[PDB]
């Protein structure tokens, strides 16, 4: 699960 979550991009400002 961690690798999948770790690929998420934060939202831009």
């Amino acid at each position: 699960i961690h690798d999948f979550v770790d690929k998420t991009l934060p939202d831009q400002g």
Partner: antibody
Framework: EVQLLESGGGLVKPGGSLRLSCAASGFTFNEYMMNWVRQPPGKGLEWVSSISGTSTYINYADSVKGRFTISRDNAKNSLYLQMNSLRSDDTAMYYC????????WGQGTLITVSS | DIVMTQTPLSSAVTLGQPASISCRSSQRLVHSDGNTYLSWLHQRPGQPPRLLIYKVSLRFSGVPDRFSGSGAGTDFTLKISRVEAEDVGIYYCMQATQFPLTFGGGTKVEIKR
């Protein structure tokens, strides 16, 4: 296992420049955002810059915008930070880190900006 | 920008007893995908930070279950159900929900012996 290792730090004069590198292995590099985070002496962690897996999205902390440039070479499994117009208060341990969770970090490299 | 206000600055805990660290976000911490991306890290002197909890409440591999995270909206908490001697050091929250990425100011845990 995942490995990240920074190089290119050291001592530089105010106004000078340095280029940091981070070599990665153990994961599919172009699938992850990569980041630079710094820790000034005696202070907490502070985000510096991020770059998405294929360089589409690049972000900088306001305090480094216009002076630092992040880039990556996916074929070389490498992340870079070009640091220009350095100031004494850029002195810090600089870490590369993978992704958005903070799970994988390099060992850090010290940048000292001093006369 | 999302400011993470982390309290307390330091906490002294008897061996085996619980500890709690709070981080409050300046605005509701919610990603466009509906989730909340906040991690808790532990750093020892001369070492990189180590991940304990990610996505608010998920434990990173190798982290013992005495560590847990929770929270929603603006209030997030790291709990240590029973402190051990090796838990000394500085803990940070980190939000990676929205740029700029931001950290709490840290909490130093001390063991009282």
């Amino acid at each position: 296992e995942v490995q990240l290792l920074e190089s290119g730090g050291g001592l530089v004069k105010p106004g000078g420049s340095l280029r940091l590198s981070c070599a990665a292995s153990g994961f599919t590099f172009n699938e992850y955002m990569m980041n630079w985070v710094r820790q000034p002496p005696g202070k907490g962690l502070e985000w510096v810059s991020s770059i998405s897996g294929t360089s589409t999205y690049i972000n900088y902390a306001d305090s480094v915008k216009g002076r630092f440039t992040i880039s990556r070479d996916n074929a070389k499994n490498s992340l870079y930070l070009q640091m220009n117009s350095l100031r004494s208060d850029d002195t810090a341990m600089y870490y590369c880190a993978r992704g958005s969770t903070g799970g994988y970090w390099g060992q850090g490299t010290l940048i000292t900006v001093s006369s | 920008d999302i400011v993470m206000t982390q309290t307390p600055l330091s906490s002294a805990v008897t061996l085996g007893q619980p500890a709690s660290i709070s981080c409050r976000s300046s605005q509701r911490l919610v990603h466009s995908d509906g989730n909340t991306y906040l991690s808790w890290l532990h750093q020892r002197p001369g070492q990189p930070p180590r991940l304990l909890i990610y996505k608010v409440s998920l434990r990173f591999s190798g982290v013992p279950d005495r560590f847990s995270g929770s929270g929603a909206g603006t209030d997030f908490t790291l709990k240590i159900s029973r402190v051990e001697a090796e838990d000394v050091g500085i803990y940070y929250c980190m939000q990676a929900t929205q740029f700029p990425l931001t950290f709490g100011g840290g909490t130093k845990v001390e063991i009282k012996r």
